[PDB]
Nucleic acid binder design. Sequence first.
DNA 1: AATAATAAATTATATAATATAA
DNA 2: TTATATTATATAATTTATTATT
DNA 3: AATAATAAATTATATAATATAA
DNA 4: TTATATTATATAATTTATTATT
Lengths: 157, 156
Amino acid sequence: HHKASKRTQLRNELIKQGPKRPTSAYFLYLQDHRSQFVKENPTLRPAEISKIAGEKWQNLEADIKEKYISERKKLYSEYQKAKKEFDEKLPPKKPAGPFIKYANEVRSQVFAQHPDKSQLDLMKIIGDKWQSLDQSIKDKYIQEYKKAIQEYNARYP
Amino acid sequence: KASKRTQLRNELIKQGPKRPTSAYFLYLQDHRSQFVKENPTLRPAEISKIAGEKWQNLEADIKEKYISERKKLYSEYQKAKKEFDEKLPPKKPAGPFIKYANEVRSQVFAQHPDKSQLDLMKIIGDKWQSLDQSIKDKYIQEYKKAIQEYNARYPL
DNA sequence: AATAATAAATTATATAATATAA
DNA sequence: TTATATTATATAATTTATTATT
DNA sequence: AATAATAAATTATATAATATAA
DNA sequence: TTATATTATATAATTTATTATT
């Protein structure tokens, strides 16, 4: 929907060269037994080899499905750490605006009072609450943002 | 969906010399300042609309100078463009059908003067379909030598 | 736009936790 | 929030890009 | 996706020869 | 071939992206 701004493009390009999600468990069984399914089944398309591997997967003994599941869990948590560290060194986004700040304060109370509404209807309610605020109260949130952006610009000139 | 050599070639072509501006833009370059001092209340786009009015009525001996200037810059661009294009890696050679179409197109057009290029190529596709196989093979073999030389002179 | 042959890119496929889009 | 995308891989069968011309 | 304020990006506009796309 | 894009520039005025959260 929203065409990436030039700061967002850099962030997106930076992200694209960071750590990536590890492979799935089912895939791990493939990478170990790729030369075994062709040696054993040399007569169907490469896509058909995959279909029997998935049939093999749904009917395979549980110990087996667990072993390679264990490997995905190890690979993912090391990716989790690696992604966490990377993400922290990324160029920080701008501070949220006055409304976002207000919304992140009253959201708990508003949900507690409208538990029947979806979050999207909740944000509609929160948006109308902001519109209704006393001007001196909006000013508090506009001043918080002024302080936040002044600090942000002092930290990244 | 974008071919390997095409990526390299398009990247080079991106560095090519850009075509020059119009005669009117030249006139706008020299006069915009004065136009804003004359009409201090108009949006920058309305300035441009007034520039357009001024350009159309401008003294014809003055417009000619800007036109002449434009022509001069365009000639220089053409020289730079041709000089640039001769340094590019060439496109692949045309396919056998294309070479055939190019050799028979004039005669076919003379036989079908009322047909567009699109319709002509339909006709020429049909003629290719009925060409003797040993004649098709001349074009196919011609193309094989072409692509060989091509891959020799411009390898990835 | 049309054309045909050939080069080059893409898809067909299975999994499923989960990151990401909207 | 819900709905879609992503991550691993091998290679056939397939699609679509390339090319000159008006 | 919803939300508001704010930051960033794009449009408004004149030409007209001609390149480029289709 | 016909139909559209390209090239230059100023800078208000206007439109779109950003931002956290679910």
